[PDB]
Amino acid sequence: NPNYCFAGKTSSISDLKEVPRKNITLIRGLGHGAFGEVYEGQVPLQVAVKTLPEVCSEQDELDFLMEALIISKFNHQNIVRCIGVSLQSLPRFILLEFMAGGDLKSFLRETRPRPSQPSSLAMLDLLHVARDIACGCQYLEENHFIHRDIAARNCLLTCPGPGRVAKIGDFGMARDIYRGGCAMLPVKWMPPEAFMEGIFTSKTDTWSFGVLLWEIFSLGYMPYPSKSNQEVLEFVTSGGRMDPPKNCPGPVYRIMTQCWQHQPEDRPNFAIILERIEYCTQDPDVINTALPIE
Ligand SMILES: C[C@@H](Oc1cc(-c2cnn(C3CCNCC3)c2)cnc1N)c1c(Cl)ccc(F)c1Cl
């Protein structure tokens, strides 16, 4: 059985909190991802249940185990908690903190201000989401963990409404690399040295965070509109960068462009990103900027 090391500690399958299967009830499907389903469940403690298909390979089993180990070892408010696992019954379960707001990409697209919902979201709401995820990324950075796939689709919200907290929720790329296909690489979130040399550092996540920022302030658009993966690879390698999202304040766009510096040594670490986001939240001209109404 595989081991996992995070910070200054090694953990094993035996360290996962096994929840008796009898104590777990499935309530509803949540839109089941790639390999395996996700359910809202109860243990009463409300959870999201990630399932492993009973029809899977040996490597699928180990991948599922590793994902459980990875998430169970984090301790930060902006990373989704693992309640426990049910690995001794089939299908195997990982039990996560239930984030009623769903994933960030879907939330942004569904919560875009509209003539019907005129003030569904404001600039400060967006800055608070960015700050939350940046605080999660800083925790990973200071613990030497490279996420490799920072993107809106991999972030979750505790709730739809005003008190929402954003958290990093998926660690599948990090799990794969820990031990594939070109077409499955998130190239639109990757810096030049990552997709060219396969070099990953904390500054990898900085670049990806810049792309997340664009997703957030565009309110859920796909990065590099109209461009394919190869077109983006060539665009970005040649120095090309995205334009500001519609109505994006200059101070916010400036953070994106600093995250997208060609040389990793020229990009900010997450402490600096957090400082700059906090300064944007203080600037009335930023937070008084109206978001576009679809
Ligand atoms: C594995 C799965 O986990 C969760 C999904 C959800 C979720 C998905 N959809 N919804 C809807 C529930 C009804 N209201 C709208 C959101 C909630 C909540 N908490 C989770 N821990 C998940 C998904 Cl499905 C997508 C992105 C992620 F980063 C993660 Cl980590």
289 to 109, 136, 249, 284, 285: CA distances (angstroms): 19, 26, 7, 8, 6
205 is annotated as an active-site residue: no
Active-site residue identified among 63, 132, 149, 205: 149
Distance CA 112, CA 123 (A): 12
**Structural domain includes residue 293:** no
Count of structural domains, the chain: 2
Point out the domain boundary residue: 98, 132, 163: 98
Q: Which amino acid is at 79?
A: I
Encode 23-45: b = buried (16+ Cβ within 10 Å), e = exposed: ebeeeeebeeeeebbbbbbebee
Task: Spell out which residues line ligand 1, taking CB within 6 angstroms.
Answer: 30, 33, 38, 48, 50, 80, 96-100, 102-103, 154, 156, 169-170
Assess whether 63 and 106 both reside in one domain: no
**Structural domain includes residue 38:** yes
Assess whether 274 and 242 both reside in one domain: yes
Resolution, expressed in angstroms to one decimal:
1.7
Q: Is the peptide bond before 91 cis (omega within 30 degrees of 0)?
A: yes
Give the method used. X-ray
Distance CA 1, CA 250 (A): 51
Which DSSP category does 113 fall into? -
Sequence-distant (6+) residues with CB within 8 A of 89 are: 21
Q: Domain range for residue 9? A: 1-98
> For a pocket test of ligand 1, which of 103, 158, 215 has the largest count of ligand atoms closer than 8 A to its C-beta?
103
Distance CA 39, CA 97 (A): 12
Distance CA 264, CA 274 (A): 18
Q: How would you classify the pairing of strands 102-103 and 155-157?
A: antiparallel
**Are the C-beta atoms of 83 and 96 separated by less than 8 Å?**
yes
174 Cα to the center of ligand 1, angstroms:
19
Which ligand 1 atom sits closest to the C-alpha of 106? 16
Distance CA 288, CA 281 (A): 10
Q: Is 123 helix (H, G, I), strand (E, B) or coil?
A: helix
* Token couple for 38: 């996700």
Q: Is 125 helix (H, G, I), strand (E, B) or coil?
A: helix
Encode 127-164: b = buried (16+ Cβ within 10 Å), e = exposed: bbbbbbbbbbbbbbbeeebbbbbbbbbbbbbbeeeeeb
Which DSSP category does 292 fall into? P
Sequence-distant (6+) residues with CB within 8 A of 168 are: 78, 79, 80, 133, 136, 137, 140, 147, 150, 154, 155, 156
Distance CA 70, CA 15 (A): 12
**Structural domain includes residue 110:** yes
Category of 282 on φ-ψ map: left (φ > 0), alpha (ψ -120 to 50) or beta: alpha
Assess whether 213 and 238 both reside in one domain: yes
Distance CA 152, CA 293 (A): 21
